[PDB]
Design a protein around this ligand. Sequence first.
Ligand SMILES: *[C@@H]1O[C@H](CO)[C@@H](O[C@@H]2O[C@H](CO)[C@@H](O[C@@H]3O[C@H](CO[C@H]4O[C@H](CO[C@H]5O[C@H](CO)[C@@H](O)[C@H](O)[C@@H]5O)[C@@H](O)[C@H](O)[C@@H]4O)[C@@H](O)[C@H](O[C@H]4O[C@H](CO)[C@@H](O)[C@H](O)[C@@H]4O[C@H]4O[C@H](CO)[C@@H](O)[C@H](O)[C@@H]4O[C@H]4O[C@H](CO)[C@@H](O)[C@H](O)[C@@H]4O)[C@@H]3O)[C@H](O)[C@H]2NC(C)=O)[C@H](O)[C@H]1NC(C)=O
Lengths: 58, 146, 69, 361
Amino acid sequence: GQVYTEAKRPPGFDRVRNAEIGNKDFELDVLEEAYTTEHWLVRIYKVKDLDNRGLSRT
Amino acid sequence: KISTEVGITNVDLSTVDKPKTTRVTYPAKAKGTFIAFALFFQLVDVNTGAELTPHQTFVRLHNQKTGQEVVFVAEPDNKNVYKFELDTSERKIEFDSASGTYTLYLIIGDATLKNPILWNVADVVIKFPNLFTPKQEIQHLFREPE
Amino acid sequence: LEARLAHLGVQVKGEDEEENNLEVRSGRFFTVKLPVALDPGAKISVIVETVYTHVLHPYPTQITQSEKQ
Amino acid sequence: ASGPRTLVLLDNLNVRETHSLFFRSLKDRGFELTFKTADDPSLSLIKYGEFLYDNLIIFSPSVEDFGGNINVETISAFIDGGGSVLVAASSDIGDPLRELGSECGIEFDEEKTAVIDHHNYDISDLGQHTLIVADTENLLKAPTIVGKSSLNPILFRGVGMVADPDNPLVLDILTGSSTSYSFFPDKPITQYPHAVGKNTLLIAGLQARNNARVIFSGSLDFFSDSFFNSAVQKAAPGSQRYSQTGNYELAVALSRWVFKEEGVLRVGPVSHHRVGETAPPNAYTVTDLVEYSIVIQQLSNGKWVPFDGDDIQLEFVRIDPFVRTFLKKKGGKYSVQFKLPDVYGVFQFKVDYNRLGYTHL
Ligand SMILES: *[C@@H]1O[C@H](CO)[C@@H](O[C@@H]2O[C@H](CO)[C@@H](O[C@@H]3O[C@H](CO[C@H]4O[C@H](CO[C@H]5O[C@H](CO)[C@@H](O)[C@H](O)[C@@H]5O)[C@@H](O)[C@H](O)[C@@H]4O)[C@@H](O)[C@H](O[C@H]4O[C@H](CO)[C@@H](O)[C@H](O)[C@@H]4O[C@H]4O[C@H](CO)[C@@H](O)[C@H](O)[C@@H]4O[C@H]4O[C@H](CO)[C@@H](O)[C@H](O)[C@@H]4O)[C@@H]3O)[C@H](O)[C@H]2NC(C)=O)[C@H](O)[C@H]1NC(C)=O
């Protein structure tokens, strides 16, 4: 919800569904990013390992 | 900073009626069995008539069979008389498992007293309703040829 | 750096190059045959040029996306 | 094991004198000790993505500014990089120490709250009955973490804590007596106290998934030269009066355990093959006898001797264990032979040896 996909549209627009995104900003708890192709056509994430200190998250 | 005996007037065990009452002195393991229950307290200093709130006024329930111990704090009432009540329907999280017999220890500690009591009063009956050790062996069950 | 040498070439001031034979006589010393023999008191500008490879290591081994190696 | 170089923080430099015996013992094992003032500016645990000090020790309650590079986040990264951290706290914990405790799953009590006991406080308290005399009865009962000898009552004068019930890793090396509640010294209780019962650990310790031992010690006063050389006698009328506290043995045992000295297990080369062969063949056929052999070592004073390994369990698992047998010791190798299960597919030999007070495998 930051990229300007279209000339005159709200920042964070979706071309395929012609609608703005709802969850503008969030942080993936378990899936750290690993790669995202130039056109954002295929995104590859990577499941994080179990937390070292044994905390509930990650 | 003068220390005096904690003392006890009347440990009154009154079973809850879903209300008969019994009374027992400080050095007297209450005879009988109580099934649910609120008990009456009366703390008073000696050598001078003076009810003195001690810093620690607990009520410990001990499960001899399972080893779990739950501690309940006691609150002074308007009559300067602590009262401990067990609903038998509330506190599901507090009492997950039901045990037929529970030890009902009494703990009263204070910074400026010289008689920390731990004597259990009686038995309570409540009817409200690992990885480190090696695991059990598993053996595959082979198929049978025709 | 003996086990890292890339091409090592010798020269003489002006348009010339020399042959550096590789022999053992230990750091694999290179024998260079001067084009013109020099008598005592002579001077010969030998522009020795070498190139070392794989000799630069990044001290911070794991930089993030935005750091200078 | 880990590197000898250890960095020790101090509230004031005058602690080394008061803590002379324990530091000397800690230096018997060849450790290189660098003492830094808690508030020293040039305090750098990490530099250019490489840790300088292999182990960290903290003896500084009443701190709120660790220094240049020492942060709770940096300490968490350290513990994630295999470092071993030892801490202490005496009624002056401070917000950074509480944050670091919370990260590992141990809920330190309030700043001014000290564990209290009325039934069992020795005659040397001289004041509020807070000189807890932790008996040997309630203990971890392990051979590596708390040693193997016999101990006398251990004097404790500190702030209690409570383990988080979400953490499986957290192990309670000690627990307070059934009367210890750990609340404010002189204040009435109108709400449930912190760790009112047997949950006031006071020597709680961690064991990370990557084998980074951490030992959140209740009280700094526990390591005091006075406590090491003092006599113990509970104030209960007519209790025994031991001439020696028995604290030194426990302190030395916990120090050795936290520095990967007493218990460490390393997994050597593994080998699996058909019965009667010498090399692991690709794609074992269904219902084919298979033999598995794995060497294990124990690190006894650095000798790396073979582990006794009574109960090590091999699991042949696809998504859930199809086979689970006991490896049999034979000439230093743990070897077992078993027919492969009828079901085909991919499988996983998965020797897992997780035991209390040992390394994970
Ligand atoms: C397509 O993909 C699918 C998705 O993966 C595949 O479907 C999977 O298939 C496997 C196996 O076929 C299933 O596992 C089986 O589940 C059975 C039912 O689930 C139980 O769930 C409860 C347990 O829940 C958890 O319990 C613990 C708790 O921590 C946990 O460790 C455990 O992993 C589990 O998650 C349980 O309470 C319920 O009552 C259900 O039983 C279950 O019965 C199976 O257990 C078998 O098998 C496993 C390994 O196969 C053993 O480890 C077990 O101990 C138990 O072993 C028994 O059967 C063996 C032969 O299979 C014998 O050798 C054993 O001795 C033992 O036999 C005893 O019992 C027999 C009667 O049952 C007696 O005759 C004997 O005498 C013995 O007394 C197993 O766990 C997956 O659940 C399933 N996935 C899903 C999503 O459902 C599918 O296979 C794929 N397609 C193809 C073609 O492959």
